[PDB]
Symmetry: C3
Amino acid sequence: ELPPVASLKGKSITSAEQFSRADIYALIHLASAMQRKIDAGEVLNLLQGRIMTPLFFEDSSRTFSSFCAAMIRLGGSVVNFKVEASSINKGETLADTIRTLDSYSDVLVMRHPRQDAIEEALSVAQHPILNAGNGAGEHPTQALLDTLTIHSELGSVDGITIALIGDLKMGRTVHSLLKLLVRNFSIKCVFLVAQDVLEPLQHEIATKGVIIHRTEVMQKSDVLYTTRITIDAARMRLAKEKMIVMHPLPRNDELSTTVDADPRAAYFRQMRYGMFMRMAILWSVLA
Amino acid sequence: PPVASLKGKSITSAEQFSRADIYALIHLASAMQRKIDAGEVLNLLQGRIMTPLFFEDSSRTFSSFCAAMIRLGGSVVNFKVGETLADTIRTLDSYSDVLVMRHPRQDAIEEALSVAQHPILNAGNGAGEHPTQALLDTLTIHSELGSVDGITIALIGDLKMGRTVHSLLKLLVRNFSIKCVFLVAPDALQMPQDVLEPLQHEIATKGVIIHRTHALTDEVMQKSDVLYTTRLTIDAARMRLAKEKMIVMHPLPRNDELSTTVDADPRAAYFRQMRYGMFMRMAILWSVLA
Amino acid sequence: ELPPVASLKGKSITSAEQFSRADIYALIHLASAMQRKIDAGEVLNLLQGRIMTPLFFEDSSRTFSSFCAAMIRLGGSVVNFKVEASSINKGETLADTIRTLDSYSDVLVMRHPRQDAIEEALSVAQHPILNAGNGAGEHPTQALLDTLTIHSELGSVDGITIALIGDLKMGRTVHSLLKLLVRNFSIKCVFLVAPDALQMPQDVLEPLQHEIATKGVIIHRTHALTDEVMQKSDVLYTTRLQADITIDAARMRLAKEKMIVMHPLPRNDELSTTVDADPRAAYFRQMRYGMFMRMAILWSVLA
């Protein structure tokens, strides 16, 4: 019914590159099985007596709350550790902070801007660590929920035309999304609406025959993915019938509130797919 | 049994409740009290999530709502408060079963309602209302005094900005036959007209007596079944004027207006009032999410 | 199983002085039994429906988190009151705050930088309060879990030689630990390692004087970690400044084979990371013992 993904058991998750196609599909179907059960109004006790602790050294609305609700809806609990009210103010090191939370918890959810910080944490923690985002563009559960969103709303990820839109120079998190999409699925076409990112993919781009075009988008795209070239109701008049608009959030003026009523606006539903994908992930790690 | 009338509703105003609704809530609160005090566990809302969305500070309101959800077997996702209020609401709405919102602007409850898919419980909208505070106040009166109709109540303090007294006056005038209401306040902090005017017809019809005073007269002390003071003096000296069968209430927090000298008086119901509050909110939350 | 320690039923915990040796061993053994159950994977429901509210007016990592984790693993719940986001900002007194959380809660866990704030709290609270640290006064539950650590790691507390190291003046953990050990056990020798400015206060040492004399406990002050201290001590218990008293790998060459290094934590440079791979390094394991001791305590208070 809710079979854990075996390959993730006990694994720390820090990068989307750690997943095969087969993991990605298994997580998608597990998250869908989670949605069915939860929207039926039924309880899960799968992680009763298990603790997640968040270590957020940066702010998060979405990701922090999503992670907590996921754990709770699996029947688990959350220790509300706050970095700003911690013994870090008395000089405690990052390594000592990890060992501390590791003495009480079953899983840690870490958000820290620096990649070598999550790495130092991995070298001292006995329990799994899940990366909730860093400045290197590693946000693996965002990449997976985005992919679940496309799959669920359109029926499939293979075959799609997708526009990536916004800060695609310094937006390291979408560079990861592209890589997951390109390595695991058969994308028809990418638009980059605005070197080191596309080069590692050139092979699969050629092998799989993925058409690329930097910048017409409105008419051809199955997915308009934007980040904080404005999308509004007027521009949506040119979009196709079966398509979606996505945004990891938060947004500024690049995505008008005039889109919010459009049934193709998928960026609020996107957050709820996030809860279910994170349920799929937590259960799989801790089963 | 959950109060059916509240099922899946948001709670924004004292005005939405019938007399039957209130008593149903009360009888439900009192059953919950008895089971909690007998050590009975209630697993009524397992796997439901409340998110408190507090843009102003709170000790009671925040904590009672969290405590009430927990005592119903429910859970709480804490959320620390650049992005719009509507976008924030949708975010919390994407994982919660119920939102508890307190916000300094009066009309923000209404804006949140306009984008929220799940029920929102108004926990203070500016100078407007505090609905669940009025329900728990009335539960306090019923439990401590044994009846609500026929009481003489003094509402003391800042009646102008006090959301609690706005809601409490509204709840008692519409659904009960109170005998007398003292409004005890200096002219500039008196109960506004936008609260009193709409109640005029009910006051007239039920023969409610309304007296305004600028200070806590001996008459007020000597005739009230309930002294409900609010923040911006009652002390043990003044409590010597109180009747034997009566209570002192205050929604809290207090400063000087309610002295610590009163605290040990059997009639000081304002601490028990917080606990009635927890049981009332259990009744509310269960009713909404049944 | 896991019968509660009856003597703690309904009791606030303010001081290491309030316990008997029987209470101490019962708590230690209960915590060990909790550890076996949790590590076997059992899901406890002993405190289903019960609430702890943390009330921390100072920073914390271990004490806050272990108490929350202890309550959870007992099947209990936590209300996350934040002092910074509270009605204390609108004029509310400590006493009214206590009465507020007391109206909803089964147990309060209180840390406050004022030494007598805990007495004020107890004066108005109907429900139990556990002292998680009162200024430079005490940290009673730390002393309990430290003693569980010693017992579990060494197998005995009577007859040990223990060095208390660092800032003994302001160190609330060593205040509680010294009182707990001296009153209830037959300690052979206590080394008090600290420069004169930071030595163990007389308001701790003087009350224990009779007991030390009757039990023949040897008390020896030093300024540094001398060869003697290193060679004789079964426990090295070191603290942070709230002197050559630093423990590192090279200093550990003088340590005996059967001994442990402890630190209540957080640490600064007084306890080098070069010690961390040493099997005698017990200060991480000490945190996990702390969670199990707080489970023993919370259960015994609330059963």
